[PDB]
Design a protein around this ligand. Structure first.
Ligand SMILES: *[C@@H]1O[C@H](CO)[C@@H](O[C@@H]2O[C@H](CO)[C@@H](O[C@@H]3O[C@H](CO)[C@@H](O)[C@H](O)[C@@H]3O)[C@H](O)[C@H]2NC(C)=O)[C@H](O)[C@H]1NC(C)=O
Ligand SMILES: *[C@@H]1O[C@H](CO)[C@@H](O[C@@H]2O[C@H](CO)[C@@H](O[C@@H]3O[C@H](CO)[C@@H](O)[C@H](O)[C@@H]3O)[C@H](O)[C@H]2NC(C)=O)[C@H](O)[C@H]1NC(C)=O
Ligand SMILES: *[C@@H]1O[C@H](CO)[C@@H](O)[C@H](O)[C@H]1NC(C)=O
Lengths: 219, 210, 217, 110
């Protein structure tokens, strides 16, 4: 079996592209092995229904990413934080795009990307919950953001929630991760007027004999 | 057992200068690992599996090889790259190279001299150490005429120097003259003279009593 | 979160043995081999050996076999190395490290300075290095401290408890008749000094010494 | 915006809730702001609940409600409650045990 050892990373972090995990970009496996003390050292976050994202990725058996050309008109792409130091300076999840205002304007973002391929695509995105109201407006201008992601038949709208949280890596704000699978012939459309942590492409999905195992056994 | 003769032993390069260091195995290996080491710090993995960069290692670094000879090349030296690089064979009882000191070169600078006298404190114990600090100069080639010019017959002088810094890239040094309290107290003035490339005229700081 | 904390520096007479420890935290201790490498002044890096905690499959470099002894305690998450029958040739910095199978994930400990000698440990005497008067070149004043006669290494100086962490030059110590002497300089604007504070914090752990000399005129 | 650390050797269970006012007046009369929010989190999870104003079937004379929630806080963790209205604050924690217990729906005489 192709045993790929996660070492200090958990599949999810390898997925999102936490810097210490970037070493797994594009990895495949028959059994991904997760260690008991693996840790996350990038922007604090959470995955509503984490067990399912882990399971489906664990079964897809591949982290093959494909960068697509999203066009984020009028917002400042690629936003790092020191909690996710990418080398000596600030960084962020290699697979997400932190969109923030440009100048003094965060325009309504409404983009789309069609699945013209013969395969299913998996889009990982997220929403940012600012610690305080200032941060909210300082970052996205409007006082209440919203992330609406949909395909032709499903939809998901997430409103961010402002508030303090336990300090983690110095931050008391968070990112909430979400996913959207887009079937061939379908089309993805992201619309948001603030707080979006934009995707960069799609991971390819496979159905095989793969899975993940929590183990501290020496390979 | 799989001896790595990594050998440009020392390297002096200028910013932007391409650099390439080689390492050879005394048999055959599959991958070469390169650890970078700056002073007073544990080695950091820089390039593993011959050509892959560790997290954070700038792009100007790369590695290659495939048999006996391997290398670590740097597109364009930066001040921050002055370190000591080691190669690491892992194909049995692991072994490391002897390293390659990668020293940058920078515009010459004169030594900032300052001399100090045996503090009353030290003196109370019966000892007198007159220290002289020659700081932030370049090149590392410096000359300290201690023993008071004319009387200048070097003997009770210990010398020391820092290694090249990585931001300032200059070098620094500390010379110490140690006498027997009263013998110190039985002499004229104390003078520390220094001669460096920047000038023909040696820098002189001094104190005149005791 | 990965961190290999190593025991403090040593000083063992020629012939006995020193026992270095290395506490691992941030990863499952029993999953990866902990390897031992040393640094002898002007010699490079020397692979000593390794142990797989919980299985104790230990692999020695022939040169240290039955000389070197690797053990590792799971509950405490600590691996240990014991080197017996010492010579001055075993004086060096010993690092422990978890390089895993993928060196993107390699982690070396801070290091443990092992000093092999008959010499007794002596506290240091820290003297204040202040200027007399003639300071024409008064852009920024350079002061210093002299730590004389201590054994063994190391000693650690500091200026204004970590504040003055800029124009400081700590020079490598010199070994006189089996006793060390070192000195460190500090450069501050000529303004914040003549009648200010500026103190050098010397510490010699080997003998439980802590001296803070305020540099006064 | 308060916090309470689990310095104990055991898991804690915090039961809290949010109040949904029947009408807009009640909302402002009670919590002032026009839209409350309850954000409860530990170091890794989080829960934000926004109240929903509206009438409901009269129950015990009231047509407003309370919605109950819980948050388990593992040892070494810390709880932080932040809200600008509509919180039905906890008072402590219930201790949690793992044993042979359970519950049974029955009308049998013991
Ligand atoms: C809401 O309440 C929470 C909890 O009281 C506040 O969180 C606290 O934020 C402070 C920021 O000063 C954190 O301080 C930092 O502590 C760490 C560890 O001690 C240290 O590295 C830093 O030096 C700094 O002092 C504090 O730890 C953190 N506590 C918790 C549980 O998160 C939050 O600020 C409050 N907001 C308001 C407006 O009251
Ligand atoms: C929205 O519509 C609902 C339903 O029509 C209203 O609920 C009703 O509220 C009245 C308040 O007068 C309740 O009356 C009480 O009835 C009980 C039982 O008959 C009795 O004990 C009291 O004497 C009183 O009359 C009524 O029962 C209740 N009906 C239901 C289904 O809840 C609600 O007030 C409406 N709000 C508005 C603005 O229209
Ligand atoms: C991952 O694989 C895809 C598809 O073959 C490729 O285009 C992409 O750039 C690869 N990523 C890396 C890090 O090589």
């Amino acid at each position: 079996h192709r045993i790929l050892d996660g070492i200090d990373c958990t599949l999810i972090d390898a997925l999102l592209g936490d810097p210490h995990c970037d070493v797994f970009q594009n990895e495949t496996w028959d059994l991904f092995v997760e260690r008991s003390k693996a840790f996350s050292n990038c922007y604090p976050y959470d995955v509503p229904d984490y067990a399912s994202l882990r399971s489906l990725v664990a079964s897809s058996g591949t982290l093959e990413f494909i960068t697509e050309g999203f066009t984020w008109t009028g917002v400042t792409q690629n936003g790092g934080s020191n909690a996710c130091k990418r080398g000596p300076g600030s960084g962020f999840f290699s697979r997400l795009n932190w969109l923030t205002k440009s100048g003094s304007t965060y325009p309504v973002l409404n983009v789309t990307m069609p699945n013209n391929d013969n395969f299913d695509k998996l889009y990982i995105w997220g929403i940012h919950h600012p610690s305080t109201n200032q941060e909210q407006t300082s970052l996205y201008v409007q006082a209440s953001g919203r992330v609406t992601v949909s395909t032709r038949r499903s939809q998901q709208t997430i409103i961010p929630n402002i508030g303090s949280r336990p300090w983690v890596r110095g931050l008391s704000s968070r990112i909430s991760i979400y996913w959207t699978i887009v079937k061939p012939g379908d089309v993805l459309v992201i619309n948001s007027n603030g707080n979006l942590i934009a995707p960069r492409g799609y991971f390819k999905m496979r159905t095989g004999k793969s899975s993940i195992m929590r183990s501290d056994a020496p390979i | 057992q799989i001896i790595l003769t990594q050998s440009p032993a020392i390297m002096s390069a200028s910013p932007g200068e391409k650099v390439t260091m080689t390492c050879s195995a005394s048999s055959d290996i599959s991958y070469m690992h390169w650890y970078q080491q700056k002073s007073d710090t544990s080695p950091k993995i820089w390039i593993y599996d011959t050509s892959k960069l560790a997290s954070g290692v700038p792009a100007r670094f790369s590695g290659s090889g495939s048999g006996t000879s391997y290398s670590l090349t740097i597109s364009t030296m930066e001040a921050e790259d002055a370190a000591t690089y080691y190669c690491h064979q892992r194909s049995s009882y692991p072994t490391f190279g002897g390293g390659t000191k990668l020293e940058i070169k920078r515009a010459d600078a004169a030594p900032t001299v300052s001399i100090f006298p045996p503090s009353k404190i030290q003196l109370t114990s019966g000892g007198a150490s007159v220290v002289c600090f020659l700081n932030n100069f370049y090149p590392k080639d410096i000359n300290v005429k201690w023993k008071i010019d004319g009387s200048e017959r070097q003997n009770g002088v210990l010398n020391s120097w820092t290694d090249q810094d990585s931001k300032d890239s200059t070098y620094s040094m500390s010379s110490t003259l140690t006498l027997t309290k009263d013998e110190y107290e039985r002499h004229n003035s104390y003078t520390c003279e220094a001669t460096h490339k920047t000038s023909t005229s040696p820098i002189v700081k001094s104190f005149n009593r005791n | 979160q990965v961190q290999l904390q190593q025991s403090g520096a040593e000083l063992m007479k020629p012939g006995p043995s020193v026992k270095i420890s290395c506490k691992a935290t941030g990863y499952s201790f029993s999953t990866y081999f902990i390897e031992w490498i040393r640094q002898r002044p002007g010699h490079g890096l020397e692979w000593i050996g390794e142990i797989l905690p919980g299985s104790d499959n230990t692999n020695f470099n022939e040169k240290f076999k039955d000389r070197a002894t690797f053990t590792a305690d799971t509950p405490s998450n600590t691996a240990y190395m014991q080197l017996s029958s010492l010579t001055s040739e075993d004086s060096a910095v010993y690092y422990c490290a978890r390089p895993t199978g993928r060196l993107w994930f390699s982690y070396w400990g801070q290091g443990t300075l092992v000093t092999v000698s008959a010499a007794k440990t002596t506290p240091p005497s820290v003297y204040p290095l202040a200027p007399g008067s003639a300071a024409q070149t008064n852009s920024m004043v350079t002061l210093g401290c002299l730590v004389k006669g201590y054994f063994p290494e190391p000693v650690t100086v500091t200026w204004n408890s970590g504040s003055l962490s800029s124009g400081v030059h700590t020079f490598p110590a010199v070994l006189q008749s089996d006793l060390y002497t070192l000195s460190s300089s500090v450069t501050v604007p000529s303004s914040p000094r003549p009648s200010e504070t500026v103190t050098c914090n010397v510490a010699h752990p080997a003998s439980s010494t802590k001296v803070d000399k305020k540099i006064v005129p």
